[PDB]
Design a protein around this nucleic acid. Structure first.
Lengths: 213, 83, 62, 136, 98, 25
RNA sequence: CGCAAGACGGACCAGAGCGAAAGCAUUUGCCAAGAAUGUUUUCAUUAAUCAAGAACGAAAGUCGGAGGUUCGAAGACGAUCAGAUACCGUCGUAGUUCCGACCAUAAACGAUGCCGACCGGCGAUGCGGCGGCGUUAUUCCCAUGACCCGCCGGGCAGCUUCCGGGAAACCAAAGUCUUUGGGUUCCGGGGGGAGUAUGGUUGCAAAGCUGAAACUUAAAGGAAUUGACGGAAGGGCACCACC
């Protein structure tokens, strides 16, 4: 008999300072109606934000899961929750007559943000190559896959959650893997195709407030 | 070709044939005078070695075994024998 | 929506179920470069002027 | 339907989850998140016969009824996540998909980013139908 | 009589290959046996691409494609006119039609 | 009759023949 | 947004690889095995093919234990229909999964036994080895990968032709066959009756292996041809078709 949309507070979504474009969008939430609170059913919303909407003028095939970790007043302050390639891009890369090489690492940062990265790589048909195939021997695949994992441990274990997200904004991990693996088999379309947040530490507001400037 | 010289094929033909499939069975292997910059003198190694040929008086390791012909450690030159 | 005028530069051939619509590359008279393919009923020849009630639609080429 | 939004040029986004199966088409606008929804009208909500629940016309009526509901709340632009029946079933989106997207491209909604969220299985459960398939 | 040397599939030194479900049916057809189409396709055909670029938030946003690999049984492939009965000579022509 | 269903008729009739020959032993 | 469970291992995935066949596709570790190549290693005929005997053997099925997500024999209903205990649809039992025993069969097919010899061409490919301008990476070279041009050996294949064969379809094997003999195993003798009855044997059962006769019958069958037909695909023509 009544409008539920009458009682929706309009809140701003803030990106952490490691990104360029600050405002993400607007998130309607029902006001505090006795027991259940506006901020209560608002402090776990995922935002699948494209890099092009988030960093100024860069690739638009990378997305970033950012979750509302605390709501001060009118602004929802978000923290990194995951990264993923657009499936349009990811399906464009996976094609025939080349070796799709993948690798995951259950790897943990300095502070207790235990991530799961996902590397991908695709064996490159050469400049003067006439042989259609361009496949890697099983031992060539698992030296690349061994390299993929060793580099993804290196750039995550040694530095904090702020400084791994800044390595995901360029292809700073995917490029170093692509450089190293040229001496094994030249693969070209090398990314970190996904990053999955598994175990967050205890929430510290003072820690989040330094990520927002 | 109906007519060939099966009696007397060219040398370029005979090296383009399997060692067993030659008109007389001849090997592709040879004995080589390998010499290291560790010592002075010449050790006689087999072309298709397959053992880690150590030097005279245990100076170092000359030869690393591979699939076919064995690689020689850089610095160790070789000279193929005649017979 | 403006009721525009186009002109037949060439008829592309007869299309439709019973071949009941001449498929025509029409030429507008606002800009003399902008041209679309359109399905036209009745007898059409080169030179005559059409009256397109909209300039948005296009005929799917056979 | 009253936000403190800046009103002139700066767009207010939602994401419309266009799920086009072969027997119905769901035009469903949510926030940037997806957690709070805004409008949802389907093909079968508009046209009252089961065979034309999935017609591109029924999906058009929905996206028109979605878009004019979405302008009352003042969500100006839409991100898009197109979806087929997916899983072990069909990955090709339904006939109502394109007409519904075109319908809120004609209505007055700005179009953000378009992608597929068709639930593609890495490796699937067994599919409905026999060994010998769906005979006709 | 033997109609096709390959017996209408592409196993030679296997013995067994894992059956896939047909997309139209769900007939369990061997992977090598199945008629396969990798259709790369725009999310909008020609009637909407004019209407969406006009009503875009973003200038120079190329409309992304829809990557589906179609597996068919022989009864679905021929009935949907993907493949087609050919003359006994023309059968052997393995060149895909342009 | 399909040769498989001809074979299935025998395996039901052989099955009832064994049945009768157990009753007589 | 989480959480739980049990399946399955998409795309990459190929007329590609591996295995005796059945079969085998997420990561990494462990275990023993294996072909091929390389070999101026070793033994020196140790070999080939094999009654009896033996290992393995898809799926379904059986037995006991764990599990049961999806699908789904039976079963229930909704449809369709003249009927519809079918196809279609909604459910759902055994089963499908795992552990341990049984079963020993498939269009288990390349419908093509294995070992050896010989008899055309070509471009590929997988693997190992060998050699040969040059590009690229570890750059800082050397040796190595990635290409590139071959050669060689085995491998899955492909095209090509008056090798020749074959009833032909087709086949470099199904050739080297009346100009008939390299070795050896299994197995056929018109179609039915019949893989039946019977006896033996194996199995918990289902059934597996072995396997008749009376009687019946002038054909059954193969390949290819021409027509006719098609609820196959295409291309036409016609105001006795349509617009």
């Amino acid at each position: 008999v009544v409008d539920p949309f009458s009682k929706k507070d309009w809140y701003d979504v803030k990106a952490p300072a490691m990104f360029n474009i600050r405002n993400i969008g607007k998130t309607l939430v029902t006001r505090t109606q006795g027991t259940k609170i506006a901020s209560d059913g608002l402090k776990g919303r995922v935002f699948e934000v494209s890099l092009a909407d988030l960093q100024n003028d860069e690739v638009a095939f990378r997305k970033f899961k950012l979750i509302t970790e605390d709501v001060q007043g009118k602004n929802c302050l978000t923290n990194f929750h995951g990264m993923d390639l657009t499936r349009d891009k990811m399906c464009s890369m996976v094609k025939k007559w080349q070796t799709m090489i993948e690798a995951h690492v259950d790897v943990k940062t300095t502070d207790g943000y235990l991530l799961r990265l996902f590397c991908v790589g695709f064996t490159k048909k050469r400049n003067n190559q006439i042989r259609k195939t361009s496949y890697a021997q099983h031992q060539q695949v698992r030296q690349i896959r061994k390299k993929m994992m060793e580099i993804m441990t290196r750039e995550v274990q040694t530095n904090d959650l702020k400084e791994v997200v800044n390595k995901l904004i360029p292809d700073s991990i995917g490029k170093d893997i692509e450089k190293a693996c040229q001496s094994i088999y030249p693969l070209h379309d090398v990314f970190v195709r996904k990053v999955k947040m598994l175990k967050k530490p205890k929430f510290e507001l003072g820690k989040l407030m330094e990520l927002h400037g | 070709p109906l007519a060939k010289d099966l009696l007397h094929p060219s040398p370029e033909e005979e090296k383009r044939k399997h060692k067993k499939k030659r008109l007389v069975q001849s090997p592709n292997s040879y004995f080589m005078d390998v010499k290291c910059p560790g010592c002075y003198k010449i050790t006689t190694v087999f072309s298709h070695a397959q053992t880690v040929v150590l030097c005279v008086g245990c100076s170092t390791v000359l030869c690393q075994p591979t699939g076919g012909k064995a690689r020689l450690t850089e610095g160790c030159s070789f000279r193929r024998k005649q017979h | 929506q403006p009721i525009k005028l186009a002109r037949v530069t060439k008829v592309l051939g007869r299309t439709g179920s019973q071949g009941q619509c001449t498929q025509v590359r029409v030429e507008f008279m606002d800009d003399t470069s902008r041209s679309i393919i359109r399905n036209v009923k009745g007898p059409v020849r080169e030179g005559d002027v059409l009256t397109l009630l909209e300039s948005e639609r296009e005929a799917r080429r056979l | 339907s009253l936000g403190p939004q800046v009103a002139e040029g700066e767009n207010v986004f939602g994401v419309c989850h266009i799920f086009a199966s072969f027997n119905d088409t769901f035009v469903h606008v949510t926030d940037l998140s997806g957690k709070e929804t805004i409008c949802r009208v389907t093909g079968g909500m508009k046209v009252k016969a089961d065979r034309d629940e999935s017609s591109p016309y029924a999906a058009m009526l929905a996206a028109q009824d979605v878009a004019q509901r979405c302008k009352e709340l003042g969500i100006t632009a839409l991100h898009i996540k197109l979806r087929a029946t997916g899983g072990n079933r069909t990955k090709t989106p339904g006939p109502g998909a394109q007409s519904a997207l075109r319908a809120l491209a004609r209505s007055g909604m700005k179009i953000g980013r378009i992608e597929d969220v068709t639930p593609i299985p890495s490796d699937s459960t067994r599919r409905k139908g026999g060994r010998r398939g769906r005979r006709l | 009589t033997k109609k096709r040397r390959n017996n209408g599939r592409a196993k030679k030194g296997r013995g067994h290959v894992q059956p896939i479900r047909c997309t139209n049916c769900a007939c369990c057809v061997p992977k090598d046996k199945a008629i396969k189409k990798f259709v790369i396709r725009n999310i909008v055909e020609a009637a909407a691409v004019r209407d969406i670029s006009e009503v875009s938030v973003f200038d120079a946003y190329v409309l992304p494609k829809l990557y589906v690999k179609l597996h068919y049984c022989v009864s679905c492939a021929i009935h949907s006119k993907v493949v087609r009965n050919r003359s006994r000579e023309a059968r052997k022509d393995r060149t895909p039609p342009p | 009759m399909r040769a498989k269903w001809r074979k299935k008729r025998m395996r039901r009739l052989k099955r009832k023949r064994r049945k009768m020959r157990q009753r007589s032993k």
